[PDB]
Amino acid sequence: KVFGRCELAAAMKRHGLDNYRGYSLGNWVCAAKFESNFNTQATNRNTDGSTDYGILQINSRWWCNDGRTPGSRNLCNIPCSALLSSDITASVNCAKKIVSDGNGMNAWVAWRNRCKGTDVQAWIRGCRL
Ligand SMILES: [Cl-]
């Protein structure tokens, strides 16, 4: 799925991300916008040889097992390709683990560089939550 902005905000809220570990919903919507352009199927290779998967661009180096990575840490205990569905449950569940481990959202590079410190509430304006 390519989500609309408020559509994704509502889905993320149903999946418990509103204020999860202290991060308001706008943070999560901004992250998805700049990580994946609201796209559940997006994947992106990185310069370190890893790949980011799905709506929240979960990275294969630490978080999911891509089936190649020798000695994969797989901290979310999930195949990376299993993050590529229109249903956001698995990506949300892994995001919850990431933000808990990091005491923050800094692992999301796009969030850290394009969302952090901005008026993230603008991302949920008009969504009637
Ligand atoms: Cl929705």
**Which residues, in sequence order, are bridge partners of residue 53?**
43, 58
Known catalytic residues are 35, 52
DSSP state of 79: B
Cβ contact 45:53 at 8 Å: no
Q: How far apart are the CA of 48 and the centre of ligand 1, in A?
A: 34
Contact by Cβ (8 Å): 87, 93? no
Give CA–CA dist 28/80, Å, rounded: 20
In a domain, 79, yes or no: yes
The count of domains in the chain is 1
Residue 33 lies in a domain: yes
Residue 9: give its domain's CATH number.
1.10.530.10
Strands 58-59 and 51-53, how do they pair?
Answer: antiparallel
Domain contains 80: yes
Residue 110 lies in a domain: yes
Q: Let me know if residue 129 belongs to a domain.
A: no
Dihedral angle sign, alpha carbons of residues 109, 45, 15, 123: positive
Structural domain harbouring 63: 5-124
Q: How far is the CA of 84 from the centre of ligand 1 (A)?
A: 17
Whether 60 and 74 have beta carbons less than 8 Å apart is answered as no
Tell how far the Cα of 14 is from the centroid of ligand 1, in angstroms: 8
